[PDB]
C-alpha cells in the first residue's frame, strides 16, 4: 500500500477503561486525512467525527493529504478521541 | 448521565472502582446501563 | 531567570503556560517530554476544564506520590471546596484527569461523585443525576432476584 505509519492512542473506546496502544496503518502519501480516519474506524470502530489527529503538535485538517504535512514512511501521528455532536 | 456514550461509560466505570460492595448493589438498580457496568468481573475480586 | 515551562492548548483555543515540573504531574504529558516549542494540543480538554486542572496541579505542586479497602472520606479540605462544581464539570474532570493520567486528581474527583451515591436509594440516585428509569416492570423484578 506504499507507506506504513503509526498512530498512538489513549482512549477508553474498546471496553471502557482508558489504555495506551500504537496501531499500524497502511497509507499512500496521497491519502487524505478523511481516508486516514476511515481506516482508523475500520480497525477501531471509532467514527471519524470523534477522531482528531495530530502530527508534530499540529492538528491535521480533514480535506488535506499526508504529503501536505510531509507525513512519510514510519511517521507517527497522535489520535485523540473527542465527543460527538 | 444515562446516555450510552463512551464518555458516560468511562466516567461511571471510573467511579464504580471507588464504590464498596454495598453501594454497587444499589447502583445496579438505577438503570439498564449501570446494571451492565456494575456486573463486570473486574469490580468484584 | 525563568524556569522551563510548556504551553497547553485547550480545545477552545486558549493556551496555558505551565511550569514543566507542575505539568509532569500528568504522566501523559510527562512521557511526551521524555521523548518544536509550540503548544501541545489537547482537543479533548476545553479551557475551563484545563483551567481547573492547572489549578489543582499548582496547589498540589509540592506533594510526593494502593490495592486495599475503599475509602472516600479522605479528600483534603481544599479539594472538596474546589470540587463544588456542577455535575457536568465533575464528569469532564474525570475525563481530563483520566486522559492526562493524574492519579491524585482522578481520585478526589471520583470520590466526590462516589459520595453523592453513598447512602442513597436507586431512586435517589436517579433524582441526583437526572437518570431516567429505562427498566420495564418485569425487568425491574429480575434485577431484584
UniProtKB/Swiss-Prot annotation, chain A:
Q: Where in the cell is it found?
A: Cytoplasm; Nucleus; Mitochondrion outer membrane
Write down the superkingdom of origin: Eukaryota
Membrane topology for this entry? Peripheral membrane protein
| Every Ubiquitin-like domain range | 3-81
Write out the PTM section of this UniProt entry: Phosphorylated ubiquitin specifically binds and activates parkin (PRKN), triggering mitophagy. Phosphorylation does not affect E1-mediated E2 charging of ubiquitin but affects discharging of E2 enzymes to form polyubiquitin chains. It also affects deubiquitination by deubiquitinase enzymes such as USP30. Mono-ADP-ribosylated at the C-terminus by PARP9, a component of the PPAR9-DTX3L complex. ADP-ribosylation requires processing by E1 and E2 enzymes and prevents ubiquitin conjugation to substrates such as histones.
Function, as annotated: Exists either covalently attached to another protein, or free (unanchored). When covalently bound, it is conjugated to target proteins via an isopeptide bond either as a monomer (monoubiquitin), a polymer linked via different Lys residues of the ubiquitin (polyubiquitin chains) or a linear polymer linked via the initiator Met of the ubiquitin (linear polyubiquitin chains).
Q: Any idea what this protein is called? A: Ubiquitin
Of the intact sequence, the residues represented are: 152 to 223 of 229
From Swiss-Prot, chain B:
Q: Where in the cell is it found?
A: Nucleus, Nucleoplasm; Chromosome
Tissue spec. comment: Widely expressed, with highest levels in brain, testis and ovary, followed by lung.
Look up what happens after changing residue 6 to V.
Reduced interaction with UBB
Occurrences of domain F-box (ranges): 3-45
Disulfide pairings: none
Family membership: Belongs to the JHDM1 histone demethylase family.
Function noted in UniProt: Histone demethylase that specifically demethylates 'Lys-36' of histone H3, thereby playing a central role in histone code. Preferentially demethylates dimethylated H3 'Lys-36' residue while it has weak or no activity for mono- and tri-methylated H3 'Lys-36'. May also recognize and bind to some phosphorylated proteins and promote their ubiquitination and degradation. Required to maintain the heterochromatic state. Associates with centromeres and represses transcription of small non-coding RNAs that are encoded by the clusters of satellite repeats at the centromere.
Q: How does it assemble?
A: Interacts with CBX5/HP1A; the interaction promotes CBX5 localization to chromatin. The SKP1-KDM2A complex interacts with UBB. Part of a SCF (SKP1-cullin-F-box) protein ligase complex.
Domain note: The JmjC domain mediates demethylation activity and is required for satellite silencing.
Report what the protein is called. Lysine-specific demethylase 2A
**Organism from which the protein derives:** Homo sapiens
User: Which part of the full protein is shown?
Assistant: 888 to 931 of 1162
Swiss-Prot record, chain C:
Got a GO cellular component term for this one? Cul7-RING ubiquitin ligase complex
Q: Which organism is it from?
A: Homo sapiens (Human)
Say where the cross-link Glycyl lysine isopeptide (Lys-Gly) (interchain with G-Cter in SUMO1) occurs. Answer: 132
- Location of Phosphothreonine modifications: 121
Q: GO MF terms on file?
A: beta-catenin binding; cullin family protein binding; F-box domain binding; molecular function activator activity; protein domain specific binding; ubiquitin ligase complex scaffold activity; ubiquitin-like ligase-substrate adaptor activity
Primary gene name: SKP1
Q: In which pathway does it act?
A: Protein modification; protein ubiquitination
Summarize the subunit comment.
Interacts with KDM2B, forming heterodimers. The KDM2B-SKP1 heterodimeric complex interacts with the PCGF1-BCORL heterodimeric complex to form a homotetrameric polycomb repression complex 1 (PRC1.1). Component of multiple SCF (SKP1-CUL1-F-box) E3 ubiquitin-protein ligase complexes formed of CUL1, SKP1, RBX1 and a variable F-box domain-containing protein as substrate-specific subunit. Component of the SCF(FBXW11) complex containing FBXW11. Component of the SCF(SKP2) complex containing SKP2, in which it interacts directly with SKP1, SKP2 and RBX1.
Region ranges (Interaction with the F-box domain of F-box proteins): 94-145
Maturation and modification: Undergoes autophagy-mediated degradation in the liver in a time-dependent manner.
Keyword Oxidoreductase on entry: no
What the entry lists under InterPro entries is as follows: SKP1, SKP1-like, SKP1-like_dim_sf, SKP1/BTB/POZ_sf, Skp1_comp_dimer, Skp1_comp_POZ
Family classification: Belongs to the SKP1 family.
Its BP terms in the Gene Ontology are:
chromatin remodeling; maintenance of protein location in nucleus; positive regulation of ubiquitin protein ligase activity; proteasome-mediated ubiquitin-dependent protein catabolic process; protein K48-linked ubiquitination; protein monoubiquitination; protein polyubiquitination; protein ubiquitination
Q: Where is this region: Disordered?
A: 58-73
Q: Which Pfam families match?
A: Skp1, Skp1_POZ
List keywords of the entry alphabetically.
Answer: Host-virus interaction, Isopeptide bond, Phosphoprotein, Ubl conjugation, Ubl conjugation pathway
* Protein name, entry field: S-phase kinase-associated protein 1
Amino acid at each position: 500500500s506504499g507507506m506504513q505509519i503509526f498512530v498512538k492512542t489513549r482512549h477508553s473506546y474498546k471496553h471502557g477503561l482508558i489504555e495506551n496502544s500504537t496501531i499500524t496503518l497502511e497509507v499512500e502519501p496521497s491519502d487524505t486525512i478523511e481516508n486516514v480516519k476511515a481506516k482508523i474506524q475500520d480497525k477501531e470502530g471509532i467514527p471519524p467525527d470523534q477522531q482528531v489527529l495530530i502530527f508534530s503538535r499540529k492538528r491535521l485538517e480533514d480535506g488535506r493529504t499526508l504529503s501536505d504535512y510531509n507525513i512519510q514512511k514510519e511517521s507517527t501521528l497522535r489520535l485523540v478521541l473527542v465527543f460527538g455532536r | 448521565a444515562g446516555d450510552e456514550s463512551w464518555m458516560q461509560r468511562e466516567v461511571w466505570m471510573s467511579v464504580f472502582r471507588y464504590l464498596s460492595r454495598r453501594e454497587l448493589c444499589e447502583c445496579m438498580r438505577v438503570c439498564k446501563t449501570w446494571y451492565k457496568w456494575c456486573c463486570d468481573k473486574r469490580l468484584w475480586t | 531567570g525563568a524556569m522551563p515551562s510548556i504551553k497547553l492548548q485547550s480545545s477552545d483555543g486558549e493556551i496555558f503556560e505551565v511550569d514543566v515540573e507542575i505539568a509532569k504531574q500528568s504522566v501523559t504529558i510527562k512521557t511526551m517530554l521524555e521523548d518544536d516549542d509550540d503548544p501541545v494540543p489537547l482537543p479533548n480538554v476545553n479551557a475551563a476544564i484545563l483551567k481547573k486542572v492547572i489549578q489543582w496541579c499548582t496547589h498540589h505542586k509540592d506533594d510526593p506520590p494502593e490495592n486495599k479497602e475503599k475509602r472516600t472520606d479522605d479528600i483534603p479540605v481544599w479539594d472538596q471546596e474546589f470540587l463544588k462544581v456542577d455535575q457536568g464539570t465533575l464528569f469532564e474532570l474525570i475525563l481530563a484527569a483520566n486522559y492526562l493520567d493524574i492519579k491524585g486528581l482522578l481520585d478526589v474527583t471520583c470520590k466526590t461523585v462516589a459520595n453523592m451515591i453513598k447512602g442513597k436509594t436507586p431512586e435517589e440516585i436517579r433524582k441526583t443525576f437526572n437518570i431516567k428509569n429505562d427498566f420495564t416492570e418485569e425487568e425491574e423484578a429480575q434485577v431484584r432476584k
